[PDB]
Design a protein around this ligand. Structure first.
Ligand SMILES: [Zn+2]
Ligand SMILES: [Zn+2]
Lengths: 125, 127
DNA sequence: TGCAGGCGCGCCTGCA
DNA sequence: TGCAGGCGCGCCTGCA
DNA sequence: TGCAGGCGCGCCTGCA
DNA sequence: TGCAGGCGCGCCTGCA
């Protein structure tokens, strides 16, 4: 537990280039999900109640499989798993989908599920 | 132009190892400044009003010159200039004190000024 | 309708 | 094949 | 000589 | 007092 003065000084802290890019990625995601009824609400539910099961929160898959946000490319499930669960996540080799996920990245479907609680972290083989 | 829902989703964002280390460094700083009358108030004033002049906000200098925060060592003025002004700051070679600073790191005194607005960013010289 | 500017997927290339 | 990075057309948006 | 990194004793604090 | 845990400066070492 920190002091109110500590919280105030941390409000003046400058975010690094990576933190600023993550904000852009969350913003790019919301723009897509706002077009789908209940998607925003489902993602918020998954981030708020980790122990509770949640539905798939998907986005369209590109031919390459990579997603671009502000001049940077990456795998969509890796990008959002890094934002909300594991900032030190190395690659998709460190992820495996849970059995409930109907649209995991590896399934190569039209839609890709980006619900970070539909993936588990594994040791890279 | 941030939407309320974006503000909420960003509240659930995990800070990286570097962001978490910075919180420890700010906490380690406050513990030292709380012992000095008006030091906390002066630092808050310098971060809130960047165009306004402010006094020195100093901490004791070690023999080495380096400060340790949670198993990691660095120069104190570099640490706090990175927190509040330039996250991409490479070394002390990229900093020069202002003329108003009475306690710059380079002057080698018993106290070192860590007010980030008492330093200016310069290009590091070619070796 | 003329004139701009911002974004990203698709396309291409280059190591290993 | 896996993995990455550079480039630009097409699409979208906003004025007067 | 500049620049790092690893180790532990001394110091401080918090329950009972 | 007894007992424990967290933190960092000082000390040491190793390059180029
Ligand atoms: Zn899913
Ligand atoms: Zn100063």
């Amino acid at each position: 537990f920190t002091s109110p003065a500590v919280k105030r000084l941390l409000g003046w802290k400058q975010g690094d280039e990576e933190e600023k890019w993550a904000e852009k990625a969350v913003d790019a995601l919301v723009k897509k999900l706002k077009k789908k009824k209940g998607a925003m609400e489902e993602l918020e539910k998954a981030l708020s109640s980790p122990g509770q099961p949640s539905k798939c929160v998907t986005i369209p898959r590109s031919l390459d499989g990579r997603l671009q946000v502000s001049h940077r490319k990456g795998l969509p499930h890796v990008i959002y798993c890094r934002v909300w669960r594991w900032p030190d996540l190395q690659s998709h080799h460190e992820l495996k989908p849970l059995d409930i996920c109907e649209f995991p990245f590896g399934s190569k479907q039209k839609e890709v599920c980006i619900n970070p609680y539909h993936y588990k972290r594994v040791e890279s083989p």
